[PDB]
């Protein structure tokens, strides 16, 4: 039954929490068999279909038990393949709806602290990746995305994406990316309302010792600007002269890819039909050496057409002041 199966699983769940050994090897094995028959009901056994009647009766018997909050609260205690199940089962429910409205969204809107338990999971290396799979499934829904982007726990990423484990650092950046992108009309509303602090911490990223972090952030800056929804932020960015001071230097970077990535932010400053004074102060003072640079800058890239067009253009701009 879908009714008893959650009751049979909640007991073995509570049991494992705050314990042992002999009754831990027996108990933690029980949660596993539970989580598989759990996932079995949500993915249609071998009778072809998930029934949608048995799946409906199961779905409700879950927010009522409230075990989901604690299941996340003690993910570290589950086994590898069970942790894999937990996400797999969770990812089903988050998606499922009658058609009109997703009930999982409305349920998590209630039990709120369940979301930030996941963002906290980035500090447990044994749980970090799992948590990623959940949150990026959670960010997909607008009302859940509203909660995290505008949270205080949001500015934790800036050292999560610096975490010593490259895998985890990467996985965090993937969420980080997906938040500031997914709902562009939601994401845009956040950035001008928080410019100073957000870009204060972001500026540190572009100065990173870590090659990937540096690259990916510079690339992510590019996309964020070249966006119809983020127009009010880009203009506010492409005018502060500190921002242009940096990009220019990143063009001198040891790395080809980094430079090229920088160039795409660089061009946006120099294409501005409403340049403000400090930008021109910098561009005019360096006029001579700049035409000198763009002439020589990645000429190997011969078949790039659009890039060379952009280049010949940037020189007319700099030449004509």
């Amino acid at each position: 039954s879908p009714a008893d199966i959650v009751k049979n699983l909640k007991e073995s769940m509570a049991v494992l929490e705050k314990q042992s050994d002999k009754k831990a090897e027996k108990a933690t094995e029980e949660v596993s068999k539970n989580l598989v028959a759990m996932k079995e009901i949500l993915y249609g056994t071998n009778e072809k279909e998930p029934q949608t009647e048995a799946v409906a009766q199961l779905a409700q018997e879950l927010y009522n038990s409230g075990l989901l909050s604690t299941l996340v609260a003690d993910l570290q205690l589950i086994d590898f393949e069970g942790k894999k199940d937990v996400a797999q089962i969770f990812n089903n429910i988050l998606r499922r709806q009658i058609g009109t409205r997703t009930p999982t969204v409305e349920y998590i809107c209630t039990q709120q602290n369940i979301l930030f338990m996941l963002l906290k999971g980035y500090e447990s290396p044994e749980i970090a990746l799992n948590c990623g799979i959940m949150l990026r499934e959670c960010i997909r829904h607008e009302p859940l995305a509203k909660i995290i982007l505008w949270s205080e726990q949001f500015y934790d990423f800036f050292r999560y994406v610096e975490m010593s484990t490259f895998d985890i650092a990467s996985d965090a950046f993937a969420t980080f990316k997906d938040l500031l992108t997914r709902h562009k009309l939601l994401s845009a509303e956040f950035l001008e309302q928080h410019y100073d602090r957000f870009f204060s911490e972001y500026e540190k990223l572009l100065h990173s010792e870590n090659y990937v972090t540096k690259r990916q952030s510079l690339k992510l800056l590019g996309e964020l600007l070249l966006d119809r929804h983020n127009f009010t932020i880009m203009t506010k960015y492409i005018s502060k002269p500190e921002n242009l001071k940096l990009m220019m230097n990143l063009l001198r970077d040891k790395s080809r890819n980094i430079q090229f990535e920088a160039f795409h932010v660089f061009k946006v400053f120099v294409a501005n039909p409403n340049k403000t004074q400090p930008i021109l102060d910098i561009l005019l003072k360096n006029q001579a050496k700049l035409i000198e640079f763009l002439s020589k800058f990645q000429n190997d890239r011969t078949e790039d057409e659009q890039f060379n067009d952009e280049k010949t253009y940037l020189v007319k701009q700099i030449r004509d002041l």
Partner: peptide, 5 residues
């Protein structure tokens, strides 16, 4: 080398 200062 760029000149800012």
């Amino acid at each position: 080398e760029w000149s800012f200062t």
